[PDB]
Amino acid sequence: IELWTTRNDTTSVQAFYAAEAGLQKYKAALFQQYVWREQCFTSLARGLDLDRDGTITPFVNNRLVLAQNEVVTDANGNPVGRYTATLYKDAQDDQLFTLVSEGTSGGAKARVQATFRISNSDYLEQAIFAGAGANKWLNGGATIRGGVYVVGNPNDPDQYVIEANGNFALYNRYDLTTYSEVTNRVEPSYRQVQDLCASLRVQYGKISVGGSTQIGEPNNKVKGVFVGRGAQDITGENVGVCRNNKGVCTEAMGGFDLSDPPPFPTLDAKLDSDACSAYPTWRACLQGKAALRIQRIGNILSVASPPNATLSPSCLQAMQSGTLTLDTQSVDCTFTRLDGSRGGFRYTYTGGQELLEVFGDVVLEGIDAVLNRPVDYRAQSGSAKSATLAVLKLGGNGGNLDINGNLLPDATFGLFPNHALGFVAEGDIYQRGQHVMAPVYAGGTFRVVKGNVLFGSVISNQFCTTSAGNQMSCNASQKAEVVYIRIPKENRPALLPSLRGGKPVFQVLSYERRLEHH
């Protein structure tokens, strides 16, 4: 709202009010279009979603009319004037917008206008976010339903960071009927999605694409391929080809398309997220927000949380060795709070279909974890049905995770992705179970066996596929698969990274009002 003192005649002041009525109405609407995108995502420079249903009305010749001859009314609801609000985008900078409201009132005409700089967070949505690798970021076959973001090595922007010549497919849809009886773990609205919002981004480096590689499909194809310094760093036999089961099928194709892009999140760097931004490091955050937190320096197991609640010796017995393996004997790491709330994790064994409930977030430092049998999970943190398990390194020991059986959420409790269990591993992750449904972070590398599929997302410094569980050699030629399933920001494991494309800004660069007639 803008208030000022004047000595102008009543006539011109009413012309100003008419215009200022238009500007401040649609400055609010413009800001509201800015908050609706901080909640598929498309930038403001490509139009507005005036409905708020995904229908975008674009800018024509950099201009978009928001209101033509709309009338301003007095307190009694009679016409005092008309105004016309027009929204203009800058030809050069796709973040600069000018809102203009020409007003008229009783034969007096006034014009007021404001320039904004608007940029959205653009929460990154990819099946695989890769880090810095070893000079290899994805090794071995893969079929990725979702985006793949790779950061690369800033001190070598000439390194092919993806030399896919076959053995690699990246799609922008999935349907969960194609997998063995896992559809009853996911919410109806989430079982077949045809817009995954996939893209290929590589911040530092080049990429090569050879025959039978498939970045998108002729029908449903990827929403952009933004690599390195420009379109120059998109090499290969298959660029511009978009025939079926070959080539790069893309809408847009240039260089890395992000300002303020996020670095690979690491335990020892600040992680600016709704839960962890106050702490100096992501690790300090996990440590401090953990419900259950156990450390292990050599043979000592020191409990650091819950500091005012008791544990069962069964719980601490299980991690004696420095490796928590679940398998065939139940382990109860829960405790009860002051107010009758539970905390920790509990792992029952059935004979059939196991259970691992997690109440709040739990982090084990200097401890490895292996879940050696299929297990259903249930997780909550008071209101929300989400939680995190962290295995962190401590003195170079621990921090690895092994999921050798299936790992799904329990249908009874909740359904994906309104029910998710997240995994932070500072070391490596090896999945030999056929189906695990979780968002996953591996500070080191994330290994997976041909044939097994992970639903959720992997953030990891390296991704690798292997021929068999026996193996740890990355050279593989068959395919593992990752299926990106968006998890809504609410009911998302708080202690996981929330990677943003850019910084959120809604800032006024200038404001002006001119009288144009009497």
Contacts of 451 (CB under 8 A, 6+ apart): 434, 478, 480
Same domain, 163 and 106: no
State how far the Cα of 251 lies from the Cα of 265, in Å rounded to an integer: 29
Q: Are 127 and 484 in contact (CB under 8 A)?
A: yes
Same domain, 402 and 418: yes
Distance of CA 94 to the CA centre of its chain: 23
151 is written with which tokens?
A: 């950061």
Q: Are 331 and 338 in contact (CB under 8 A)?
A: no
Peptide bond before residue 417 is cis, with ω within 30 degrees of 0: yes
3-state secondary structure 2-13: CCCCCCCCHHHH
By what method was this entry solved? X-ray
Chain interruptions in the chain, by residue before each (C–N > 2.5 Å): 39, 133
Same domain, 279 and 318: yes
What's the first-to-final CA gap in the chain, in angstroms? 25
The CA R_g of the chain, rounded to the nearest whole Å, is 27
What is the domain extent for residue 253? 124-499
Residues β-bridged to residue 401: 369, 429
Residue with tokens 């050069």: 92
Same domain, 66 and 208: no
Residue with tokens 């800058």: 90
Q: How many domains does the chain have?
A: 2
Same domain, 455 and 510: no
State how far the Cα of 165 lies from the Cα of 410, in Å rounded to an integer: 39
Residue 302 has, within 13 A of its CA and on its CB side, a CA count of 8
315 is written with which tokens?
A: 């719980």
State how far the Cα of 318 lies from the Cα of 466, in Å rounded to an integer: 30
State how far the Cα of 365 lies from the Cα of 455, in Å rounded to an integer: 26
Same domain, 116 and 129: no
Same domain, 299 and 344: yes
SS3 46: helix
Sign, CA dihedral 470-471-477-483, equals positive
Same domain, 484 and 356: yes
Q: What residue type is 15 in one-letter code?
A: A
Same domain, 435 and 334: yes
Q: What are phi and psi of 11, to 5 degrees?
A: -60, -55
Which of 285, 246, 248, 245 shows the shortest CA–CA distance to 265?
Answer: 285
3-state secondary structure 369-417: EEECCCEEEEEEECCECEEEEEEEEECCEECCEEECCCEEECCCCCCEC
CA dihedral 180, 181, 183, 185 (to 10 degrees): -120
State how far the Cα of 387 lies from the Cα of 55, in Å rounded to an integer: 35
92: left (phi over 0), alpha (psi -120 to 50) or beta: alpha
Sign, CA dihedral 375-380-385-391, equals negative
436 is written with which tokens?
A: 């695990």
State how far the Cα of 452 lies from the Cα of 431, in Å rounded to an integer: 8
54 is written with which tokens?
A: 């995904």
Which of 440, 406, 449, 433 shows the shortest CA–CA distance to 127?
Answer: 440
Give the burial class of 443: count Cβ atoms within 10 A of its Cβ; 0-12 exposed, 13-18 middle, 19 or more buried: buried
Same domain, 276 and 407: yes
CA distances from 47 to 51, 159, 173, 322 (A): 12, 36, 24, 55
300 is written with which tokens?
A: 């000592």
Which of 369, 302, 308 shows the shortest CA–CA distance to 343?
Answer: 308
Buried-state track 284-296, b at ≥16 Cβ within 10 A, e below 16: bbbbebbbbbbbb
Contacts of 429 (CB under 8 A, 6+ apart): 400, 401, 402, 403, 423, 440, 442, 444, 445, 446, 447, 458, 460
Count of beta carbons in the 10 Å neighbourhood of residue 72: 21
State how far the Cα of 228 lies from the Cα of 257, in Å rounded to an integer: 9
Count of beta carbons in the 10 Å neighbourhood of residue 303: 14
Helices H / strands E in the chain, number of each? 3, 37
Q: 3-state DSSP: the chain helix, strand, coil percent, rounded to 5?
A: 10, 40, 45
Residues β-bridged to residue 160: 206
Q: Are 366 and 322 in contact (CB under 8 A)?
A: yes
Q: What residue type is 461 in one-letter code?
A: N
Q: Are 498 and 273 in contact (CB under 8 A)?
A: yes
59: left (phi over 0), alpha (psi -120 to 50) or beta: beta
Which of 316, 323, 321, 375 shows the shortest CA–CA distance to 349?
Answer: 375
DSSP 270: -
Contacts of 273 (CB under 8 A, 6+ apart): 494, 497, 498
Alpha helices in 37-141 (DSSP H): none
DSSP 48: B
Q: What residue type is 34 in one-letter code?
A: Y
Sign, CA dihedral 208-209-211-213, equals positive
State how far the Cα of 513 lies from the Cα of 101, in Å rounded to an integer: 10
3-state secondary structure 219-262: CCCECCEEECCCHHHEECCCCCCCCCCCCECECCEECCCCCCCC
DSSP 265: P
Triad 358, 376, 449: Cα angle to 5°: 110
Buried-state track 473-502, b at ≥16 Cβ within 10 A, e below 16: ebebeebbbbbbbbbeeebbbbbbbbbbbb
DSSP 134-195: ---SEESEEEEES-EEE---TT-TTSEEEEESSSEEEES-EEGGGSTT-GGGB-GGGSEES-
Q: What residue type is 245 in one-letter code?
A: N
Same domain, 345 and 461: yes
Same domain, 131 and 111: no
Distance of CA 14 to the CA centre of its chain: 48
- Continuous segment of H or E residues that includes residue 35: helix 10-36
